[PDB]
Design a protein around this ligand. Structure first.
Ligand SMILES: [Fe+3]
Length: 185
């Protein structure tokens, strides 16, 4: 496990770590954390939208994981969501994100209430999966966009969004704003 000097080396070490069947979560998190965000490395993926956060595919991990860059304008956030029985690693490349943790709801319609919340700062790496809980990610800044590096394994095309007032969930199809630096139709 060596310190990645650049995004490209980070991706090379990631392919080595996911070469097997089973993920060593702590080692992935440690190496994502060790990568010191350099904007020159990832400017190509930092494609923003005025109305909501964008998902920008970087690498498909030989089918073992999706590595993608998310671009969060001021005030942009996600729904409360799950991660489709996959691992989710979330590293801050620039700015700050607020993460709010929720428990899976009862089957009785009730307001979802937060377990916790925390700020993720530049270069920190958060980890989550469905056995830990659900979560919402937002850029609450009024002045600074955020950029995060997300790694899901196994990859998934769809997830669930949760309505904070009832806990009822609906299915959501992930959209890509770009793939490999190329904007999608
Ligand atoms: Fe998430």
């Amino acid at each position: 496990l060596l310190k990645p000097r650049t995004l490209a080396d980070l991706i090379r070490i990631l392919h080595e770590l996911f070469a097997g069947d089973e993920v060593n979560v702590e080692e992935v998190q440690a190496v994502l954390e060790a990568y010191e965000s350099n904007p020159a490395d990832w400017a190509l993926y930092a494609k923003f939208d005025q109305y909501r956060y964008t998902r920008n595919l970087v690498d498909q991990g030989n089918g073992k994981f999706n590595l993608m860059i998310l671009c969060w304008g001021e005030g942009h956030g996600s729904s409360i969501h799950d991660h489709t029985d996959s691992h989710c690693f979330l590293k801050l490349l620039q700015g700050n994100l607020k993460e709010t943790l929720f428990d899976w709801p009862d089957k009785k319609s009730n307001e979802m209430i937060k377990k916790s919340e925390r700020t993720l700062r530049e270069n920190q790496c958060a980890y989550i999966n469905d056995s830990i809980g659900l979560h919402r990610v937002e850029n609450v800044s009024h002045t600074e966009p955020a950029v995060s590096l997300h790694l899901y394994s196994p990859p998934f095309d769809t997830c669930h969004a949760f309505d904070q007032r009832t806990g009822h969930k609906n299915k959501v199809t992930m959209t890509f704003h770009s793939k490999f630096g190329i904007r999608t139709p």
